[PDB]
Amino acid sequence: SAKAISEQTGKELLYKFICTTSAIQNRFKYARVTPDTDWARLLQDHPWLLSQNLVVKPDQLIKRRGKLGLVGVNLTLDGVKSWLKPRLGQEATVGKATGFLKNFLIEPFVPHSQAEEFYVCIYATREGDYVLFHHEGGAQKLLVGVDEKLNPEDIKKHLLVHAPEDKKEILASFISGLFNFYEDLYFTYLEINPLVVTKDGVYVLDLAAKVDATADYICKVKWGDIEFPPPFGREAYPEEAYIADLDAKSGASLKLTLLNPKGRIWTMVAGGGASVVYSDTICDLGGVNELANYGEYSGAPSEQQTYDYAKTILSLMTREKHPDGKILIIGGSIANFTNVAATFKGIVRAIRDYQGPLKEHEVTIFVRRGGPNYQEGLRVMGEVGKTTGIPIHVFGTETHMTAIVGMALGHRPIPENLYFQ
Amino acid sequence: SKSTTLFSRHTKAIVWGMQTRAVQGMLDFDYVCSRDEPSVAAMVYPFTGDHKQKFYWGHKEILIPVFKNMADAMRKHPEVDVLINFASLRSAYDSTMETMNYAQIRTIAIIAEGIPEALTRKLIKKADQKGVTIIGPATVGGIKPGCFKIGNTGGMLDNILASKLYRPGSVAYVSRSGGMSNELNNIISRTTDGVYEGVAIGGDRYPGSTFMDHVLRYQDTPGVKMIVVLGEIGGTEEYKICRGIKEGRLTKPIVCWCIGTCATMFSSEVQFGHAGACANQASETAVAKNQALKEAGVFVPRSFDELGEIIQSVYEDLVANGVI
Numbered sequence: 001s002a003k004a005i006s007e008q009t010g011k012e013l014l015y016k017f018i019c020t021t022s023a024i025q026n027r028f029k030y031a032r033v034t035p036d037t038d039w040a041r042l043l044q045d046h047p048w049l050l051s052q053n054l055v056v057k058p059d060q061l062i063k064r065r066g067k068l069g070l071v072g073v074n075l076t077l078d079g080v081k082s083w084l085k086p087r088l089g090q091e092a093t094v095g096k097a098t099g100f101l102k103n104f105l106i107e108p109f110v111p112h113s114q115a116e117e118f119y120v121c122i123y124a125t126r127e128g129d130y131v132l133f134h135h136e137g138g139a140q141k142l143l144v145g146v147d148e149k150l151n152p153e154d155i156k157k158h159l160l161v162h163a164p165e166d167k168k169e170i171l172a173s174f175i176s177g178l179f180n181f182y183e184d185l186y187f188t189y190l191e192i193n194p195l196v197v198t199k200d201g202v203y204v205l206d207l208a209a210k211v212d213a214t215a216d217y218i219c220k221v222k223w224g225d226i227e228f229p230p231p232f233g234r235e236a237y238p239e240e241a242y243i244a245d246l247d248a249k250s251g252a253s254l255k256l257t258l259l260n261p262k263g264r265i266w267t268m269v270a271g272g273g274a275s276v277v278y279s280d281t282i283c284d285l286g287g288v289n290e291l292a293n294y295g296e297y298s299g300a301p302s303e304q305q306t307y308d309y310a311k312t313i314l315s316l317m318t319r320e321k322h323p324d325g326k327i328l329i330i331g332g333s334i335a336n337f338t339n340v341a342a343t344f345k346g347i348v349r350a351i352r353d354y355q356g357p358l359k360e361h362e363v364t365i366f367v368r369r370g371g372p373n374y375q376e377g378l379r380v381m382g383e384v385g386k387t388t389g390i391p392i393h394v395f396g397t398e399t400h401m402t403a404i405v406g407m408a409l410g411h412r413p414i415p416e417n418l419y420f421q
Numbered sequence: 422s423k424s425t426t427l428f429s430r431h432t433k434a435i436v437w438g439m440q441t442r443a444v445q446g447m448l449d450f451d452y453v454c455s456r457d458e459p460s461v462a463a464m465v466y467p468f469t470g471d472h473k474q475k476f477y478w479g480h481k482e483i484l485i486p487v488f489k490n491m492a493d494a495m496r497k498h499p500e501v502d503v504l505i506n507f508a509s510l511r512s513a514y515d516s517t518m519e520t521m522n523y524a525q526i527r528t529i530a531i532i533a534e535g536i537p538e539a540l541t542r543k544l545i546k547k548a549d550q551k552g553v554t555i556i557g558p559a560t561v562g563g564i565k566p567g568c569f570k571i572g573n574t575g576g577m578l579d580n581i582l583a584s585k586l587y588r589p590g591s592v593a594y595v596s597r598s599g600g601m602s603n604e605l606n607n608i609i610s611r612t613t614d615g616v617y618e619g620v621a622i623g624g625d626r627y628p629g630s631t632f633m634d635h636v637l638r639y640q641d642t643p644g645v646k647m648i649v650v651l652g653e654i655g656g657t658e659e660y661k662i663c664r665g666i667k668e669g670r671l672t673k674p675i676v677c678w679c680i681g682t683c684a685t686m687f688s689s690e691v692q693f694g695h696a697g698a699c700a701n702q703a704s705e706t707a708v709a710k711n712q713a714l715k716e717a718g719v720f721v722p723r724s725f726d727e728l729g730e731i732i733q734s735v736y737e738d739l740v741a742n743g744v745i
C-alpha cells in the first residue's frame with residue numbers, strides 16, 4: 001500500500017536526489033525537535049539556527065497546520081522556544097483525532113512576496129500521474145501517461161501559461177526534475193505548497209508525500225531505512241513491528257494495527273475482506289470504542305506463523321483487566337486454501353500457553369470458520385476450551401459468518417444446536 | 422471492455438509456478454464438472470528443468486508437462502489461451518509482460534500480492550493495448566462452474582460439491598476479496614440456483630480488471646440473470662455501476678454491498694488488509710458508496726448480515742416473472 005512519509009523524510013530524499021538546473025536553496029537546513037531534545041547538542045549540530053529567523057511546525061502528518069496555529073513564522077530561536085512551550089509535549093486534537101505534539105521541524109524563514117508562492121502537486125491514478133501547477137500558491141493540470149516523459153518544454157507548454165515570464169525557465173526545470181524524482185523513488189503523491197521562487201532561487205517550504213511501500217525491494221538503496229509514521233492520533237507499537245516483520249518473510253499475509261490497547265473486543269480473523277466485515281459488524285453493534293485491533297492472517301500461513309501471530313494478540317489482551325472481561329473473535333470466511341487445521345492448531349497452542357492469563361482476564365472466545373480441514377480445526381478449538389476451562393463457542397459453515405459478533409456482544413442467543421457444523 | 426467470455430469447458434491454461442496442489446484442485450473440479458479434458462495443459466517453472474508431473478484425472482494417473490522456458494510451453498500448446506501466474510511479487514511483472522508477447526493468451530490471472538502499483542499500471546497499459554483481460558494482482562482468481570476455475574479458487578472437492586459449483590446457476594458475482602468470494606459461493610448456492618461465474622478482482626489499488634469490466638460482461642451474458650457485487654472502501658469504481666444503470670446499459674438486477682463502513686467511525690485513518698482499501702476523499706468511503714448505489718437503484722442490504730436475504734428476494738422475483 002501507499003504510505004505517507006514525514007515532511008523531513010521527503011525533503012531529505014528530494015535534496016539528496018532531485019536533478020535540476022535550478023539552484024535549490026536551504027538544502028538540508030532543518031532541525032528536528034522532540035520533548036527529549038538536547039538543545040545544546042541541537043545547536044552544536046545546527047548553528048544556522050542562529051543565522052536568521054525561523055519557522056517551526058509539527059511533522060506528524062497534520063494537515064492545514066497554519067490554520068491551526070501550528071506554524072510559527074519568522075521567529076528568533078528564543079521565539080521558537082517560547083512558541084514550543086505550550087505545544088511541545090502537549091496533547092492536541094486535530095479534526096477528530098487526538099495525540100501528542102512531539103515531533104517538530106525548525107527551518108529558516110524565507111522572506112518572499114505572495115507573488116513568489118507557487119503550488120506544485122503530482123499524484124498517481126490508473127491512467128497515469130497528474131501534475132498540477134498554480135501561480136497562486138500557499139490550476140493547470142496535465143495527465144502524464146504511463147509511458148510518457150515530462151520535459152521542461154512540456155511543462156512550459158501545458159502548465160506555465162499563467163506563470164511570470166521571468167520564472168518559467170526555473171519552474172520548468174524544477175518541475176521536470178521533481179517528476180523524474182517522483183518516478184524514480186516510487187512516489188504516489190507529492191505536494192509542495194508553497195514552492196517559493198525569489199531572485200535567489202527555489203525554496204521548498206512545505207512537502208507532503210506518499211510512497212508505494214511495496215517498492216522497497218526496488219528502492220531500498222535510495223530510500224534507506226525509511227520510516228512510515230502512523231496517522232496523527234495513533235502510536236506505533238512494538239507488536240505491530242513484530243507482525244510486520246513476520247509479514248515480510250513469506251507469501252502469507254499477517255497484518256496487525258492496534259486501535260485501542262485497552263479495548264475489551266479483540267479479533268483474530270482470516271482474510272483482508274472478512275476482517276473488515278467483522279470489524280464493520282462490531283461497530284454496527286455499538287462496539288467501536290471497545291474494538292482493540294484491526295488485523296488479519298491469510299494466504300496459508302504455517303502452524304508456527306499462526307502461533308506467533310496469535311500469541312502476540314493474547315499477550316496484548318492480557319495486559320490489564322477489564323471489569324466485564326474480554327472477547328476474542330476468531331472468525332473468517334470459508335477459506336479457499338488456508339489450512340484451517342494447521343492454523344487453528346497454532347492458535348490452540350497459543351491459547352494453551354496463555355491459559356492462565358486468559359482465565360484471569362475473563363476472556364470468552366467465539367469461533368466461526370470454514371475451509372480446508374476446518375472440521376479438525378473446530379474440533380481442536382472445542383478441545384482446548386474443555387482442557388483449559390476457557391469458554392469457547394465453536395461454529396462452522398452452517399453459521400452465518402458474522403453471527404458470532406452478536407452472540408459475543410449479547411445481542412442474540414448462543415445457538416448450541418449449531419456447534420461444530 | 423474486453424471479451425465478454427473468458428472461459429469455457431474447453432479452456433486450456435498454462436500455470437506459471439510449481440503449484441501442484443492448486444493444479445490438482447483444478448483437475449478435481451474439471452472432473453466433477455464433466456469436462457472432456459483437464460484444464461491445465463502445461464506448467465512453466467524456471468527453477469527446475471523440463472520434466473513431467475503426475476496428476477490424477479479421477480482415479481487415473483496422468484502426466485502434465487513442466488517447461489523451464491515459457492516459449493517451449495507456448496509452442497507445444499497452441500490450444501492454451503489462459504495463463505495463471507503464481508510468480509512471486511519480485512518476478513510477476515516480467516513474467517506477465519513476457520506472457521503478453523504470445524498472441525494466443527487472451528486472459529491472465531496474476532496471483533501475487535505486493536506488486537508495485539506503478540508496475541501494475543504498465544501491465545494494464547500493455548494488456549489494454551492487446552485486449553488481454555487481467556484478473557488480479559493479489560487475487561485467488563475466480564470460478565466458472567461447469568467450465569474453469571482459477572487455481573485455488575473454491576478449494577477442494579468437498580466445497581465444490583457443497584456450494585454446487587459443478588454446474589452453473591443464474592447469478593454472477595464480482596468481489597474485491599478472495600476469501601469472501603468463497604463465502605459468496607456458499608451464500609448464493611443456498612439462496613438461488615447458484616453461481617454462473619464469479620471473479621475476485623483482488624485488493625490492489627489498480628486491479629487489472631475492474632468491477633465495471635466484469636459487470637458489463639455479465640450484463641452481456643444471456644445465462645446471467647442477476648449480478649452480485651461485493652465492493653469495498655477505497656477508490657470510486659462502484660460509482661460506475663450507478664452510471665451504467667442510469668444510462669440504461671445495466672438492466673439486470675444488481676445487488677451490492679461495500680465493506681468498510683467501520684472506517685467512518687474511527688477517529689483516525691486505518692489502512693485495511695487490501696492495498697487499495699483506504700479512502701482518500703469522502704466519496705471513497707463504504708458508507709458514501711453504499712448510499713449512492715442505493716439511490717441509483719442497486720439493491721443494497723442494510724449490512725453484510727442481510728446480503729443473503731436481499732439476494733434471495735431479488736432471485737425469487739426474477740423466477741416469479743419468468744426471467745429464471
Ligand SMILES: Nc1ncnc2c1ncn2[C@@H]1O[C@H](COP(=O)(O)OP(=O)(O)O)[C@@H](O)[C@H]1O
Nearest residue numbers: 055063064065066071108109110138193205206
Ligand atoms: N520557511 C518558511 N519561510 C517563510 N514562510 C513560510 C515558511 N514555511 C512556511 N511558511 C508560510 O507558512 C504557511 C503555512 O506553512 P506550511 O508549511 O505550508 O503548513 P500547512 O500547509 O500545514 O499550513 C506557508 O504556506 C507559508 O506562507
Ligand SMILES: O=C(O)C[C@@](O)(C(=O)O)[C@H](O)C(=O)O
Nearest residue numbers: 271298299335336337338600
Ligand atoms: O484464509 C482465508 O480465509 C483467506 C485466504 O487465504 C483463503 O484461503 O481463502 C485468501 O486466499 C486470502 O488470501 O485472503
Ligand SMILES: Nc1ncnc2[nH]cnc12
Nearest residue numbers: 036037038039041042045
Ligand atoms: N540533538 C539531539 N538531542 C537529543 N538527542 C539526540 N539524538 C541525536 N541528536 C540529538
Ligand SMILES: [Mg+2]
Nearest residue numbers: 138193194206
Ligand atoms: Mg502548505
Ligand SMILES: [Mg+2]
Nearest residue numbers: 253272298694
Ligand atoms: Mg489479502
